[PDB]
Every structure is written in structure tokens, then in C-alpha cells.
Amino acid sequence: DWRFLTPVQLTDINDNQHLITLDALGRPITLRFWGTENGKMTGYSSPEKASFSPPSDVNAAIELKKPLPVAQCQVYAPESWMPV
């Protein structure tokens, strides 16, 4: 990701892709990986097929439904300390 000069898509030795999405200011938001295990592909659906919109609020994020095509989706609330 050339905005940060940090790696975001990693190709393994094996047939295995490991990808992350960063937000502005570069914090990791999502993780996906996929590849073959026994000559056939499994893992997480790639992002060009399985789109995903991370939740905004933390309280909103808590209530997600099961078919979530992502690992370790991050939600940040660095500003939760300010009164609003």
C-alpha cells in the first residue's frame, strides 16, 4: 500500500495468499487468506468476490451476523474518551 509503504498482500511459498486492508492513517482493518489445501481451493473468499463493509461504531460492530467473510476485522474508537 503505497500510501504507507507497508506490505498488504503477501504471497506465501505455497499456494496461499494473505491480504490486509488498511484505513487512512494505515491501521489494519481486515485480514483474509486463501489458497489450496489438497489440490483444491479453500479459505476465505477473495475480496473481489466477497465484498465487505467494516462496521463503524463499536456498539454496531458487536451485532454482526454469522456470514462474515473476513478474519480479525478491526474497529477502532481512539476518540471514545472525549465527551460528545
Binding site: 511459498i13 505455497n14 487468506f33 489450496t36 489445501e37 478474519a71
Partner: protein, 559 residues
């Protein structure tokens, strides 16, 4: 050792060794490594050792997960009469050193890498479920050709991640009580909801450090207790160095003196009783246990174990091998391995310091010595246990092969196979392990097939109560603090004969010797059979028992 050349990464290729008596080295280990070819990419094997030749046989890696774990692995043992000597460069040759009996296990993991499904080498399948916290919350087992059974109906954990509630497939429920101030187990309650019967009700009283100073069992004495109901506390006394000095508990009246021979279980028809005993432990300045004084006034068992400790090492034996501190070292080899277990039983240590053989009965030059012998894999794991009786009309061989989650107990008489039993393990020993006994041959007349054994473990993982699929008692056992048997009873001696997990979850071998991974333990002494490898022990006494305090295995993080 032989490593790859500079055109390569420099990974290990082989291990060779030579004893002083030999002219050449032998190849005991050899590693064939995966490259970066398409097949390897397909099975996620690139760069991995895929064919590992060792001292036990050959281990073959067939498939890895996207998470880096094992999905498919297979293996073969060495022919009993063929040593590992994987010379030359031809696997065709190496194959002829092996049995053609290949075992394979298969697995399925989630994205996290938690194990979800495991197929053993006979086709039996374990299935695991996890909760929202990623914790194991239940478990099932399907035997090959059978339906799926529930082994664990439910698990609940505390805030600390500790097991709080356990519900077994046999309807037995175990509740765990933790002291909330310290987050440590304070009690165990095992009950049958079918008849609201409490089988175990334990409490652990501790000093300020965390040593258990008393164990109470509020459960009632069971069916094997002839007109007895209430048990005393297991009181423990410790010194300033926290060595166990004294302890109390119950023992079978007919248990006799402690030795390497395991006692017969009491049966419910015997009408035996148990006595109240105290045992005292004396230690020298190096932490060596020098004397064990038994006292059980009901039978006036005043048996004393006298230990002779070397005056130039921390090595020690019972007085039966020698009385002289100047001679004690003569009983050990150069690496600190014990040469003889008990008088007459010789110990053969191999080139890796592992116990290769135990002579059980010394005979003439006609009849062979009874013996036990072993094979270990290239990680020090025991893979094969062979018990050879040489009696001409009773030369029974008990061949036990260890596989992940599977123990194969093959028994033959001097002419032919008498029993073929698969033991399927679900869970870890000392951690509420449940076993299934599946026979392909030789099932005893009074034993149902696909028999379940539910182990109800104590504070340190010793197995005290064994229940069946109906929540009934199969067996009951109490131990001396150092692992001897204080009390043993069972519903059926036939069933009793199959319990091998006894102390701190470890296997009691035929000789009375316990197996602990890399070392063996002698409960009649309170010492390790051989010195531990330097650097794995922080103290100086390489034969010392876990801090002379077997009551509390205070080994946080497994250390």
C-alpha cells in the same frame, strides 16, 4: 550431522552415530525435504521435511493447512529385528527395513487452526465443537462402522478460562470450584443427576503459598468398602523448603508393602476394608529422600523404605541394591542411567540415553530372559512397547503401538493372537480423558464392545475414579503421594486389567515404572530412574522429584 550444501538453505539432512565398540557410524536419521514444486504448493508442503527417517520407523508428511498445521500424516515402524541404519541414497532399500503396515491419520481445522475433526489410523473419528470464546464446548466420537456418540455433552469455563462445569455423555456432572481470590481450584464435585449421588466431593486447603495442606473428600465410601463410610483428610506437613514431610490417607488393608508389583484390586465380593495411615519422609541436604517411614496401625504396617545415597553424586538406590554410599555409583553408567532397576532386572540404555530394554526374569542359557523393550521416534517419543514373556507354555507377547489418539494393544500367546484391542483416547490424560475399548479380536466374555471409560482425575491429574457409560463405577484408586498404590478396587478384575493411566495422568508400565515423556519414574523410591538432561533442570539434583512436593504440581505454563 550432515547439512545441506551452500547452494541450498543449509537444512539438516542426516544424523549418524558411532559407539566406541563400532568401526563405522550408522545413520539413524534422514530428512527428505520438499522443494517448491507444484504438488507441494497444492498440499502446502514446500520447504518442509516430508520423509523423516528415524529410530522408530518412517514418518511421512502428506498435507498441511493454510494455517501451517497437519492435515495428513502417515507412518510405518521398523521391523523389530532391524535397527535404523538408513545408509546409501535409495528409499527402495530403506523400505525393506520397514513393516508394510502403514498408519495414516487425517484432520480438519478451522480458520483459527482449532481442531474440528480427527480421523485415526483405523478410521475412527473425533469431532470437536467450540464456543463463541474459542473454547472447547463439547465432543463426539464415531467409531468406524458405528454411530456417533457424545463423549462430552457440555463444557463451561470460568472467567480465567478454567474449566468450571463438565457434563459427560454418561450423565455424570463434575462441578469445579475455584477460590475467587486466588483463581485456583479449591474443590471438585462429581455427581450423578439420575439418583443425585455424589461420587466425589473434594476440597483443597492451602497454605499462603499454595501448597495443599489438606485434602478432604466428603463423598461417601463406595461399594467396595466393607462396612465403612467416612474417609479422613489427607493431611500434609511441609518443611521450610516445602518438602513434603508427612502425609495421611487411606489404604487397602491387604495392600501390603510398597514395591514394584501392582496389587490385585479388591472386588466388591471380597468384603475388604481400608485402613488409616500416615507416612513420613526424611531428606538429606541435597534434597534426596533418604527414608520413608510407613505407619498403618490397623495392620501394623510399619514398612520402611531405606534409600542409600551416594557420597559423591546425588545418585541413590534402595538398600536392596546396596547399603554403601561408596558403592551406589557403581550401579549407574557413565551418563547417570541406572544399570539395574531392582536386583535381577537389568536396564539397557540405548545410544540416546533412552531405555531400550528391561530384563524382567533372568534365566539359563536355554530359556530366554523375560524382557521388555522399546522403540522411540526422533523426538524421543515412545512409539512401541514390547512385553515378551518367554515361558515356554506362556510366552505371551504384548505388543503396544502408540499413534496419535490411538493405542493398539496386540496380544499373542506363544502360538497365535489372543486379543486385538484398539484404545481410542478422547482428551488428555489427567484432563478428564475418556477411553473407548474396541475389539476386533479376543473380546473377553464379560466385556461389552465399544466400552467407555470415563476418568475422573484429581488435583494433579491422577486418575482416582473410573466410570462406565451408565455412570457406574468401574474402579477406584488412591495413591501414595509419590505414586505408589495405596488403594485399589474394581467392579470386575477383567475391567481392572485395562487401566494404564494412573499417576499424574501417566502410564504405569508393566514393571511398575512410570513413563514421563523423556524419563522414567520409580514410585517405590521417590526418584527419577535416570538423570535429566542438563539445561532442562534448574536445580542441581538431576534425579530430584518435582520439588519433593508431588501433592501440588505447581508447574505454571507446564514448567
Amino acid at each position: 550431522r550432515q547439512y545441506e550444501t551452500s547452494s541450498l538453505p543449509g537444512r539438516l539432512l542426516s544424523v549418524a552415530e558411532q559407539t566406541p565398540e563400532e568401526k563405522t557410524s550408522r545413520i539413524t536419521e534422514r530428512l527428505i525435504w520438499a522443494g517448491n514444486t507444484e504438488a507441494e504448493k497444492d498440499h502446502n508442503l514446500a520447504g518442509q521435511c516430508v520423509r523423516h527417517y528415524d529410530t522408530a520407523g518412517v514418518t511421512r508428511l502428506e498435507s498441511l493447512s493454510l494455517t501451517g498445521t497437519v492435515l495428513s500424516q502417515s507412518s510405518q515402524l521398523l521391523i523389530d529385528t532391524q535397527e535404523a541404519n538408513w545408509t546409501g541414497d535409495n528409499e527402495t532399500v530403506w523400505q525393506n527395513m520397514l513393516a508394510d503396515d502403514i498408519y495414516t491419520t487425517l484432520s480438519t481445522f478451522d480458520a483459527t487452526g482449532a481442531l474440528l475433526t480427527q480421523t485415526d489410523a483405523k478410521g475412527n473419528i473425533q469431532r470437536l465443537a467450540y464456543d463463541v470464546a474459542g473454547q472447547l464446548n463439547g465432543s463426539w466420537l464415531t467409531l468406524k462402522g458405528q454411530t456417533e456418540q457424545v463423549i462430552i455433552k457440555s463444557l463451561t469455563y470460568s472467567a480465567a478460562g478454567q474449566k468450571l462445569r463438565e457434563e459427560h455423555g454418561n450423565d455424570v456432572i463434575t462441578e469445579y470450584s475455584y477460590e475467587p481470590e486466588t483463581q485456583r481450584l479449591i474443590g471438585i464435585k462429581t455427581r450423578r443427576p439420575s439418583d443425585t449421588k455424589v461420587l466425589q466431593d473434594l476440597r483443597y486447603e492451602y497454605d499462603p503459598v499454595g501448597n495443599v495442606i489438606s485434602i478432604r473428600n466428603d463423598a461417601e465410601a463406595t461399594r467396595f468398602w466393607h462396612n465403612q463410610k467416612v474417609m479422613p483428610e489427607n493431611t500434609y506437613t511441609y518443611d521450610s523448603l516445602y518438602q513434603l514431610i508427612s502425609a495421611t490417607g487411606r489404604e487397602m488393608a491387604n495392600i501390603g508393602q510398597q514395591s514394584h508389583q501392582f496389587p490385585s484390586p479388591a472386588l466388591p465380593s471380597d468384603n475388604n476394608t481400608y485402613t488409616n495411615y500416615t507416612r513420613t519422609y526424611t531428606y538429606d541436604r541435597g534434597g534426596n529422600l533418604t527414608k520413608i517411614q510407613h505407619s498403618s496401625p490397623a495392620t501394623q504396617n510399619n514398612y520402611t523404605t531405606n534409600i542409600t545415597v551416594s557420597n559423591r553424586s546425588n545418585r541413590a538406590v534402595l538398600s536392596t541394591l546396596t547399603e554403601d554410599p561408596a558403592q551406589v555409583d557403581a550401579l549407574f553408567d557413565a551418563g547417570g542411567h541406572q544399570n539395574t532397576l531392582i536386583s535381577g532386572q537389568n536396564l539397557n540404555w540405548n545410544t540416546r540415553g533412552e531405555l531400550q530394554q528391561v530384563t524382567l526374569v533372568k534365566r539359563d542359557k536355554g530359556a530366554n530372559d523375560d524382557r521388555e523393550w522399546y522403540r522411540y521416534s526422533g523426538d524421543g517419543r515412545r512409539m512401541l512397547k514390547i512385553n515378551e514373556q518367554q515361558a515356554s507354555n506362556n510366552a505371551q507377547t504384548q505388543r503396544v503401538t502408540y499413534l496419535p489418539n490411538l493405542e493398539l494393544r496386540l496380544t499373542q500367546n506363544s502360538t497365535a493372537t489372543t486379543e486385538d484391542l484398539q484404545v481410542i483416547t478422547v482428551g488428555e490424560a489427567g484432563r478428564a480423558q475418556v477411553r473407548v475399548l474396541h475389539w476386533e479380536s479376543g473380546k473377553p466374555e464379560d466385556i461389552d464392545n465399544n466400552q467407555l471409560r470415563y476418568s475422573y482425575d484429581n488435583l494433579i491429574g491422577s486418575s482416582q475414579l473410573e466410570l462406565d457409560s451408565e455412570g457406574q463405577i468401574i474402579s477406584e484408586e488412591e495413591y501414595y503421594p509419590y505414586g505408589g498404590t495405596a488403594l485399589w478396587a474394581a467392579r470386575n478384575q477383567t475391567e481392572a486389567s485395562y487401566k494404564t493411566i494412573r499417576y499424574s495422568g501417566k502410564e504405569r508400565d508393566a514393571t511398575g515404572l512410570y513413563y514421563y515423556g523423556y524419563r522414567y519414574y520409580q514410585p517405590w523410591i521417590g526418584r527419577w530412574l535416570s538423570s535429566d538432561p542438563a539445561g532442562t533442570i534448574d536445580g542441581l539434583n538431576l534425579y530430584r522429584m518435582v520439588r519433593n512436593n508431588p501433592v501440588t504440581l505447581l508447574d505454571p505454563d507446564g514448567l
